[PDB]
Structure formats: C-alpha cells, structure tokens
Ligand binder design. Structure first.
Ligand SMILES: CC(=O)NCc1cccc(Cl)c1
Length: 121
C-alpha cells in the first residue's frame, strides 16, 4: 500500500536522525569505554550483575536494521549503557565517571533530538 511505503519513509528518516544523534552521543565517549559489549571473557560474572547489557556497537546494529520505532526506544538503550555502568562500577572509577559525563553531555543532544522528532513529525 501507499500508506505502508509512507510509513517506511518516516522510519527511514527517523533512522537518519537517530544515526546523527548516535554519532553525537558516541563522540562524548572519547575513551571508547562504551563502544563495545563488556567482554564476558574479561568479566565472566558480568551477567550475574547486569541483566540487560548494552553498548554503542549493539545500538548501531539495531539502528541500521531500522530497529528503533521511536526516540523513546533509542533513549531506553542509551540509558542502559549509562545505568549498567553506574551500578557495576564504583563511584571512584574512570568507568563510573565516564558514564556520568556521557549522561550529562548527552542530555543536550537528546533534548534537541526530541524537539526535532516532534517538529518534523
Ligand atoms: C562499561 C563498563 O562497565 N566497563 C567496565 C569494565 C569492563 C572491562 C574491563 C574493565 Cl577494567 C572495566
């Protein structure tokens, strides 16, 4: 149907916007602490602690498969990256501190992204 095509065009445009957002958020992780899944070889007990692991590479896979239907779903995954890290790692670690900085700097990006998704529809 034409409606389905129209829908798919919207999803494609959302994906385009979210790809820009993801690039901007990952730029706020210059240490690449969140670039890849936490290694279950280097941290064999990780899944005993964290029930829903997330990282930028995994988000990017879902993104390019057009797997985010709305901004909320994308934000859920971004928040997992930060929240998982702030539980597994103590306050006095470069890991926890990187998550705080990513959350703080990311807020600006996500604030405008929400306005853009709304405005453009
Ligand atoms: C994102 C995150 O939580 N990283 C913690 C961590 C993973 C692997 C090795 C060390 Cl030393 C630390």
């Amino acid at each position: 149907s034409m409606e389905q095509v129209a829908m798919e065009l919207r999803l494609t445009e959302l994906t385009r916007l979210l790809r820009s957002v993801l690039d901007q958020l990952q730029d706020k992780d210059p240490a690449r602490i969140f670039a890849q899944p936490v290694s279950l070889k280097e941290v064999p007990d990780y899944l005993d602690h964290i029930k829903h692991p997330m990282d930028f590479a995994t988000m990017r896979k879902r993104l390019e498969a057009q797997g985010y239907k709305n901004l909320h779903e994308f934000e859920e995954d971004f928040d997992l990256i930060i929240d998982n890290c702030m539980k597994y790692n103590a306050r006095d670690t470069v890991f926890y501190r990187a998550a705080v900085r990513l959350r703080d700097q990311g807020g600006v990006v996500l604030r405008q992204a929400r306005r853009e998704v709304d405005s453009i529809g």
